[PDB]
C-alpha cells in the first residue's frame, strides 16, 4: 500500500532520471550533457529503466 499521491512523486526523486553511458551519472530528465568533469561532458545518455 503506497498509492500515487505517496508514490508517483517518488519516481521524480528516484525513477525519473537520465544516466550517462560512460560514468553512470544520474541526471535530470532533459539534461543534454553529463556534468562530471572526469567523464568528459559526453552527451550520450539512456533513460533510467522503469520497473518491468
Amino acid at each position: 500500500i503506497i498509492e500515487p499521491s505517496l508514490k508517483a512523486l517518488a519516481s521524480k526523486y528516484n525513477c525519473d532520471k537520465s544516466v550517462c553511458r560512460k560514468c553512470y551519472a544520474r541526471l535530470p530528465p532533459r539534461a543534454t550533457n553529463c556534468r562530471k568533469r572526469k567523464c568528459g561532458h559526453t552527451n550520450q545518455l539512456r533513460p533510467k529503466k522503469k520497473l518491468k
Binding site: I2, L9, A10, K50
Partner: protein, 191 residues
Amino acid sequence: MKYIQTEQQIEVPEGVTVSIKSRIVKVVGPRGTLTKNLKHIDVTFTKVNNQLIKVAVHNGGRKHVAALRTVKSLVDNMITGVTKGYKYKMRYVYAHFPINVNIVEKDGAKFIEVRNFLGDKKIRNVPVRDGVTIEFSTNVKDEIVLSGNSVEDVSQNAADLQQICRVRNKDIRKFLDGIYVSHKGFITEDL
C-alpha cells in the same frame, strides 16, 4: 568580447528596507532581519529611488555577467523571503513501517529525531538549521512542514532531512520509503 555594461532592477515593497554598505547586504522586514555577504562576486549597486535600485557590471566578461544575474535573483529572493516567508510541505512515505519524527531538545540545539525508519534499530538525528520553526500539518495525515526566513535556511535544512532517509544498498526503485519535499510554499496563508 566584454559586453560594456549591463544592469538589473531590484524593487522594494513599502515595509521592507535594504541596507547596502560595501557589498554587505542587510535586509529588514516583517519577518525580521536577514544578512548576506556578496563581496566575493564583485558588482556595483546603483540606487535611484527606494523601489528602484539597479545593479550593474562594467567591462566584464560572459561569466561575470552570469554572476550579476544570480546576484539579482539572490537578493530579491531574500526580499520576497522577508515579506512572504518560506514554507515546505513534506509528506511522509512509508510502506510497512511508519516513521516516527520527534522534535527533541538536546542542549537546547533543536535536534529532529527520526525513529523506526525502515524498522531499523538505528536512531537517526539531524540538527535544525537556525531560524526555521517546524510544524506538523493539521488535517493532513503524515505531513511535516517547515517555516523560515531565507531560502538557504528552509531549503538547506529541509533537503538535509530529505537525504537523511536514503535507503542503504536495497533497491531504490522498489522500496520507495522515505520523506520527500513536495510542495514549496510561502508562510503567509494568502501568499
